[model samples]
Target: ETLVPLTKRVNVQADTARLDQIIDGCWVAVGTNKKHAIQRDFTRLFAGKPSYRFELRKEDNTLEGYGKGETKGRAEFSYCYATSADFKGLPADAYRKAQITKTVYHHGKGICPQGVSRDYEFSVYIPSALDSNVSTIFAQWHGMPDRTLVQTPEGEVKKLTVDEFLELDKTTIFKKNTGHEKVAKLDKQGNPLKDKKGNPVYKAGKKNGWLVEQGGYPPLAFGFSGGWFYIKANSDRRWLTDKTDRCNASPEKTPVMKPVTSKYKSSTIAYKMPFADFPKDCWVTFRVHIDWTTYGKEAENIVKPGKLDVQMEYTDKKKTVKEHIVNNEVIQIGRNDDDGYYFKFGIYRVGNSTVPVCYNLAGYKEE
Candidate 1:
């Protein structure tokens, strides 16, 4: 058997010193005269339309130029596209689309006499395949270090690789919201329980406390009073609670409750506070304990044994922090005949006299 080389191990570096000199000397001709000797049929097709052009001015450097069209006596404007020589072999259609993608012109004054300008430093890619019709391509002159684009192309149409396509649909980004109902103990009167407002009432309190007629309590329906509540497995000792206090008068006005119960009566609510009330530049923290029993067989099949991942994101930063824990290590309570497996999660925020921040917890997966 023959052994093959690992192509990925190879490194390629172009002569940058030579590229800089070339770009300094190159100039792109732009005007209404299509018949000009320098003008070719392709140039004519591109005339009056913005285009990018390039040429070598020195053995080690290259120059890039851009141009746009104008009505009589009007100044033309144009935008800079990525510059690279990779355009040489792209199919005409691919070349056209690629050209469009690189087009950056917007209406404005004519290009600077000195050269193209750039606001940020960036690089362009050249596929491996080349087209015959295209020749040279270049990027707009930006003051940053120069970059080279190599040419590459696909030989035939085929199914796209996983890297080339998106998998999940838009809806997957949102948590599923399912409806649920709970029954409350009735009063001596045959009427459904009544709250202090004489409205249907569900009381949530410590094992012993003032029992007021009201909406469902903590761990049940959220937004009972004007405050938030949390739930914890009586046995596991880990607790779940909401950060947002109380709910609005109407169901539409209150925050949402995530019904996580699959086998037990336990669930948690992520309290809601107006954006105006959310703290700024502060850290929010919460603790959670989950009961694996609540996860149905399907969920169990998808989740590996003893592996659970948690991800956290703060509004102020661009990065996310994640942690993995074993199900047996966290507090868990098995389900009763009427109750299901139960888990608890908590929420906290950094203290700074500002409005309180909110947080959420979710399961994570590893590839």
Candidate 2:
């Protein structure tokens, strides 16, 4: 007896219920400096700024948003990028190859009282296929500049190699001179320059021949680096201990360029939380842990702790807020050992504040 092959049908059902689910209202704070405390009223200062739209979806489990804020506001808040289209304009293939690196929002009228503002914190899922090599993700708001946003699920913290750190420091702090003029320059150790009538050629504010720091570099070509530079007390190569000139040095004096063997390590943990699963009116809070360490015990003094800058970008819907903390606060380092100095960063939330949905960290070594 020949038996007809039984035909089987397979049916797949989609989770339609999750489609219309809106993310619960929540606040997110992102950064590497954990010890610094965040405030709620951070956003209200930037009233009239556009709002940023932060959206999340199930398929990709990714949160994306954009906003545009005042340039000054962005700087004040320390929301800056190593390479941004803002200063360097779009490339010839901008449309084809360019990515939207930054976006900001401005508040609209009646959303809050005139001149009232607040900041926002956004917590979203990190894509599994994310690449850390491209650039670190961050959020910027009125109180903080752009700070490190995505945290690694693993316990590993991101760090810069010694050579890479030196290269980055050189490119950021030293202005590359295009013209080749080799003149005998005297060191600024209270020494006398033969050309300056035995007097010091470079005074603190004296105008000299095209000083690089004092507007000598061409505006169009000039560039600056980010991140603070400091010296570890126990090291032999300690040059600039004062906060002002740690990273940069006077032109007359030899630049305090150090081969940074130290690595900027972050021990922050990022969780992939879904916003769509929360109730509409429910307020969400994100908890982040930040851990950081220097290279070795010899590099202890290099840790001049400071608050991080926070910034955010929402999807064309919300205004971006940028903020800076004038009250200089230090990030606490846990311990110094053969492994290095360890530290942690904490996350927080703000309700009904006028700040934007992003944040970032910004600081530079004094020159």
Candidate 3:
């Protein structure tokens, strides 16, 4: 095997149940500087007015931060994670890397009068430098504002930014443009098909949920943006009978978007990457390995094999795809997507934006 760099922030043991592990509200910590794995009440001390904070029952939390001039907004945030004690019985496989899990949901409403700029998002980050709008490892965004900049192994690269989007821009990416509508499926003969049990197939429902993270709506979307409000199971997709059949007769007024027991309706959906889709009320574990690639011979891919086994729910056989390899080079510190970056998970809001995201247990464990 080719030698690669790998790195993790924490050490942990493997899990025994081989089941999906969960994190609770007790493990999270804040303050981006030390990358501390301990939880600190965000409002432990207020910087004064315009910023307020509070914690709600049974795992519900909220945070308020800078919005150009304002310092507070009702955006639930977390740097939650499992402390070593929390992972004792977790499967052994889980301890190999500094596995971390987080959850956040946007209210589909914000403090903004124009309804909060879609120019922002609830995100995850890790940067050599603590800054925004620059470069780093990878970024996870919800209703992510378009960004035209990204740093890679190569150098600073250009992409799209939210501010540039035209007024008429649709989610153009994926569902949860706060959830839209999906239609009926038809055959070449223009007829609706039925399941093995003879049930008519209906297009699944749209997300349109108030929060992006909560609805299982991925941030990526490009299709016509219409499909699936709810879908029947596709247990045996090899046969047309296993496709779907649910709520086809009329457009649902408030279709359910949870309990993704149903298979994805239209194949039009993008990025079937495992675990790319999240389930409701569960900890979404992101097992990542950062190869600090040649940070001098000393730090050369510290997390080498580590990252190669990176898994979301579960990684893959195509496990060692190199095209996705990030070159070991100078990384942008802080906000820039430079270097592989560090973990900067929080609910970052645009002006008047009130997005509420939550996380129970969070943080990394080393093996």
Candidate 4:
């Protein structure tokens, strides 16, 4: 099908992050580069002297579709964590991930706002000796919630309606913190108070903001699983109000699905490319473009739909092969509203697989 032209471009002035900016230090500033900002997160701070979980190095014939490696930046990973720490509060027992996120270069602002079309280009080098038994997510885009729903003084958990969320200061809710910190209620003497079950008593109302729930499954994921490289999608009509189905749910709360009548409608694999088609120890370049859904833009429940375009390529000693994996296919890249979307890339896996694996990534650009 023919690709529809994207009229909206969010973060137009600041939209590119290259891999070369990463250096020995964790926070390697890009000087005046307009690629936004980046940070390396490997569960907790890497305790290893040289940081086994991630590293930046140069390889021969591994830059921008070339067959030779050069002095470019690369990120390597292993299955290790410090103590009970985890990424974005994910349970350490079941999940392990090492990734880098792109942030605004200056003050706290969204790197990828909602309802806009954007392009992301990068190169990934998968090791020939990698363990393909366990599924690993290399790139993903997470959804942001509207104004956080909180508990009131009367112990009532309520979510802000769409109108109410818009009535509040957009900038306030958009900030990293929601103002209400979950602190224990205090007695007259300023000592902590206890509840009936000896649990810490928390002040509910407006003073001590009690968050209801927030995390959910990402709208889009590009990964390698079960001997194939794949693209997956999760769409929800009431994502603003409900986020229980992080990936897949029984009696699923998420109503949107690839086929209108499927029970597991909220989550589905859009496309898959066999692992055997591409050679390992070589770079596979990807070009991804997304147009977020227009679910609520026209009317309260009207969905204008969105689309996805993904292109992949790999070159060996002989020749290069290319595949238009997903060509302008209609998809719900994200929910309606201005929750914003952010990008994270590297190794993310479920279940405990102690086997060490390293992947080299380069040429990261977003526009």
**Candidate with the greatest lDDT versus the true structure:** 4
C-alpha RMSD values across all candidates: 30.7, 24.5, 24.8, 15.4
Give per-residue CA lDDT, model 4, range 70-137, as digits (tens): 12222222111112221226544222111101122211223466677888876776767666653556
- Which one wins by TM-score: 2 or 4? 4
Candidate 1 residue-wise lDDT, 225-324, digit = tens: 1222222221111111111222212222433333233322333322333322223333322222232322232122212111111222233346543322
Better model by TM-score, 1 or 4?
A: 4
Write candidate 2's Cα lDDT for 71-144 as tens digits: 11111112112122222464553322212111111111111111122222333222223222211123311111
Model 1 misplaced regions, further than 4 Å:
1-233, 236-309, 323-328, 339-367
Model 4 alpha-carbon miss at residue 53, Å: 8.1
Candidate 4 all-Cα RMSD: 15.4
Clash counts for the predictions, in order: 47, 90, 75, 8
| Candidate 1: worst-modelled 10 consecutive residues by lDDT | 6-15
What lDDT is reached at residue 306 by model 3?
Answer: 12
Shift in Å, residue 247, candidate 3: 44
TM-score of each: 0.16, 0.19, 0.22, 0.55
Can you give the lDDT of residue 132 in candidate 1? 19
Model 4, residue 32: what's the lDDT? 16
Model 3 regions lying over 4 Å from their true place? 1-28, 31-276, 293-309, 314-352
Best by TM-score: 4
In candidate 4, list every pair of residues with a backbone clash.
16-35, 60-68, 60-69, 61-68, 61-69, 62-68, 62-69, 257-265
lDDT of each: 0.21, 0.21, 0.24, 0.48
